[PDB]
Amino acid sequence: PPVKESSFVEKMKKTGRNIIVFYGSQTGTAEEFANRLSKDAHRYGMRGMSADPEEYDLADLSSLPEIDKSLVVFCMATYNGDPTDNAQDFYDWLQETDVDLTGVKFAVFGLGNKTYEHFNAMGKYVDQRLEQLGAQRIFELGLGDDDGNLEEDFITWREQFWPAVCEFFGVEATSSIRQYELVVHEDMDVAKVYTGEMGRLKSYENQKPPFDAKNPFLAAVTANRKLNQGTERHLMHLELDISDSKIRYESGDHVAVYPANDSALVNQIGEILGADLDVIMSLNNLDEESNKKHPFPCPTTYRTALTYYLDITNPPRTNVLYELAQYASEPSEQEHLHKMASSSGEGKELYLSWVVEARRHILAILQDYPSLRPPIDHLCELLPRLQARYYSIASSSKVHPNSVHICAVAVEYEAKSGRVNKGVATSWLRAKEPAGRALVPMFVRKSQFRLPFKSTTPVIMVGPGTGIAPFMGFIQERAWLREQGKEVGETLLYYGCRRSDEDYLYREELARFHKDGALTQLNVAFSREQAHKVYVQHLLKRDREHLWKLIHEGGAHIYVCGDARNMAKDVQNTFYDIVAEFGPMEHTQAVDYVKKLMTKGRYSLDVWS
Ligand SMILES: Cc1cc2nc3c(=O)[nH]c(=O)nc-3n(C[C@H](O)[C@H](O)[C@H](O)COP(=O)(O)OP(=O)(O)OC[C@H]3O[C@@H](n4cnc5c(N)ncnc54)[C@H](O)[C@@H]3O)c2cc1C
Ligand SMILES: Cc1cc2nc3c(=O)[nH]c(=O)nc-3n(C[C@H](O)[C@H](O)[C@H](O)COP(=O)(O)O)c2cc1C
Ligand SMILES: Nc1ncnc2c1ncn2[C@@H]1O[C@H](CO)[C@@H](O)[C@H]1OP(=O)(O)O
């Protein structure tokens, strides 16, 4: 619980702001959107500001009417049906408060993903709640879908939002504007230069607990081995030494890591722009009143910024390309970049195929539109921040209290852009070689994916491919409970891979556990050892009788991990069918029954894309 800032309304008054855009974000997208909306205000005679709801008391919303033509916008993302961490406070307040918001004008743009159970739950909630409290909606709720193209949904909403705002407040719709100023440092002492740390200067060198997202622990990579036999893919297992970090974790938790971009990619960006990446500088907010003094840790070199603080691989969003159009000396290229921000037409189609679908990163665009040569400092101000990557801890703290295990597949594919794209965190992790030791800045994030409290409760685990990760931890722990004399219920694993002798991850360890009885059943679907595809859900269907027994009589907990795209849903449907047959009951009731298991904490998910 952070110390709240002074009333955001009083701040708006002292700075002449009439619009405030709050962001509920975890990977920085909502914050990006909020900043874009805040900046838009300027182009409409108004003036806004972005703000972290966590640093304020939203009860002060009731004072917003004291500012003429005032307006609050909420750009909120949803995470596992809940508010983002930074907006949990706002959410709890919204539920317990009874404050009257008469006179308050708002608008909400929800960032979500249709593939989840509770799509845009937070945005939908905030939008409905503010109205119930007496506030009035100035523009319809925006429903962004990261499963299609969030950026386009945002563009569309934003394009209609502003005219609606202008029409209601009687405002007019009336250029390039830097948010930061560049200050090169020639006489800069080395001890004051950021070299990639996230919080306090030298926090990576001088490690002080407790460690978290703002102060990650640099864990030594003690192991890093290939898990599969083939060469088409690279699946790996790493062990991070967290001794003396005082960090605690449990099977089911996730470990986050801050990676470094590819040095060659960073080098080329500087080389193509003819910039000296080793120039030590700082980018200082031109708004001396904003709490955001820099876009990232400063002072630091461009090289360090592009390596540790900036995202240089993901397809640039439209506003970035829009702002860069001014630096392309070829009219046709400036025109293309300019139209990427269109809400329809060829400009939109080109953005979706040439940039998104092709997966062109910033360097790719700089190479494919050679007249585009922006100054390095402005590019750094425009790029999004490099985010940490999450991995499902593959070990049990009951067995490995001082080590965190990771099971992952290295990302590397041929993009239609014409080049081979490499996954940032996985290429970096793959390069980490045990024993100048190899360090991984990291931190643990607690999750609700947990083994049952009672050792006697049966467990049904389903995790094909890398989805096996959390379960290696579950299995280690359940075996441990047995070795300790505890009474353990059935422990079932439904795992899957292409072929027994090619990508059967942890084959040896799983055989051992099965032999010893830690694993009651080891059901493996080898999808390519026969003409037909054989998947985990096929084995669940096979064992439908017994699984129903465990679910209906034993109170078994279900766990699904891995591919959220198709595997998760296919597995869920098979459970719908098992319930419909043995209940018995109509599909409609089977679906309700399964979704009820989820709320009662007996059907947990740890899926990703
Ligand atoms: C909660 C959670 C748990 C996770 N657990 C694990 C885990 O235990 N093990 C694990 O392996 N991963 C897991 N991940 C995924 C992990 O966080 C990273 O997203 C993944 O490892 C890739 O990161 P990267 O930085 O290497 O690739 P990035 O540089 O982040 O690139 C990823 C992007 O590349 C694009 N891409 C990937 N393949 C292709 C393709 N072939 N064709 C076109 N585009 C493609 C997609 O846009 C993809 O999102 C988890 C993710 C979440 C959210
Ligand atoms: C672990 C995880 C869980 C998510 N859970 C949900 C969810 O329940 N509902 C939803 O609509 N979107 C969900 N999403 C999608 C995000 O809401 C969407 O990607 C959003 O754009 C992220 O915004 P941010 O960068 O501002 O945090 C999830 C994403 C991740 C990575
Ligand atoms: N829709 C799905 N449901 C369950 N498993 C799937 C799946 N799609 C692919 N798989 C399998 O998940 C395992 C890990 O990726 C692979 O054996 C893969 O088989 P396939 O690649 O032969 O289709």
> Reported resolution in A?
2.2
Nearest CA to ligand 2 atom 9: 119
Residues 608 and 466: their CA atoms lie apart, in Å, by 11
Same domain, 505 and 597: yes
Nearest CA to ligand 3 atom 7: 567
CA distances for 152 relative to 21, 158, 351, 479, 603, angstroms: 19, 10, 10, 49, 34
Residue 276 lies in a domain: yes
Domain boundary among 417, 449, 481: 449
Nearest ligand, CA 608? 1
Same domain, 372 and 392: no
353 is catalytic: no
Q: Check if 572 has its Cβ closer than 6 Å to any atom of ligand 3.
A: no
CB-based contact 417:362 (threshold 8 Å) = no
Residue 184 lies in a domain: no
Residue 484 lies in a domain: yes
Nearest ligand, CA 115? 2
Nearest CA to ligand 3 atom 15: 465
Nearest to 52 by CA among 71, 31, 37: 31
Q: Check if 120 has its Cβ closer than 6 Å to any atom of ligand 2.
A: yes
What CATH number does residue 519 fall under?
3.40.50.80
Residue 482 lies in a domain: yes
Same domain, 419 and 469: no
Residue 183 lies in a domain: no
Nearest to 195 by CA among 95, 87, 297, 101: 297
608 is catalytic: yes
Surface-to-core class of residue 190, CB atoms within 10 Å of its CB (0-12 exposed, 13-18 middle, 19+ buried): exposed
Residue 180 lies in a domain: no
392 is catalytic: yes
Same domain, 302 and 391: no
Residue 537 lies in a domain: yes
Count CA atoms within 13 Å of residue 486 on its CB side.
16
Specify the DSSP element, H or E, that contains 88. Answer: helix 88-96
Q: Are strands 412-414 and 459-462 parallel, antiparallel or unpaired?
A: unpaired
| SS percent in the chain: helix, strand, coil, step 5 | 35, 20, 40
| SS3 of residue 104 by DSSP | coil
Same domain, 165 and 71: yes
What CATH number does residue 430 fall under?
2.40.30.10
What CATH number does residue 7 fall under?
3.40.50.360
Domain boundary among 449, 468, 492: 449
Q: Check if 567 has its Cβ closer than 6 Å to any atom of ligand 3.
A: yes
The number of domains in the chain is: 4
Q: Are strands 142-145 and 412-414 parallel, antiparallel or unpaired?
A: unpaired
Nearest to 308 by CA among 299, 297, 319, 318: 297
Surface-to-core class of residue 324, CB atoms within 10 Å of its CB (0-12 exposed, 13-18 middle, 19+ buried): buried
Residues 312 and 266: their CA atoms lie apart, in Å, by 8
Residues 572 and 462: their CA atoms lie apart, in Å, by 11
Same domain, 278 and 265: yes
| Residue 609 Cα to ligand 1 middle (Å) | 6
Same domain, 155 and 214: no
Structure token digits, residue 290: 């904003």
Residues 490 and 459: their CA atoms lie apart, in Å, by 6
CB-based contact 381:284 (threshold 8 Å) = no
Same domain, 141 and 80: yes
Structure token digits, residue 65: 């009417």
Structure token digits, residue 391: 């991995």
Same domain, 39 and 112: yes
| Residue 172 Cα to ligand 1 middle (Å) | 44
Domain boundary among 130, 149, 173: 173
- Domain hosting 105: range is 3-173
Q: Check if 361 has its Cβ closer than 6 Å to any atom of ligand 1.
A: no
Residue 186 lies in a domain: no
Residues 575 and 583: their CA atoms lie apart, in Å, by 12
Q: Check if 352 has its Cβ closer than 6 Å to any atom of ligand 1.
A: no
Q: Give the 3-state secondary structure of 192-261.
A: HCECCCCCCCCCCCCCCCCCECCECEEEEEEEEEECCCCCCCCEEEEEEECCCCCCCCCCCCEEEECCCC
Closest approach atom of ligand 2 to CA 144: 21
Residue of 203, 561, 563, 604 marked active site: 561
Same domain, 410 and 424: yes
Nearest CA to ligand 1 atom 19: 389
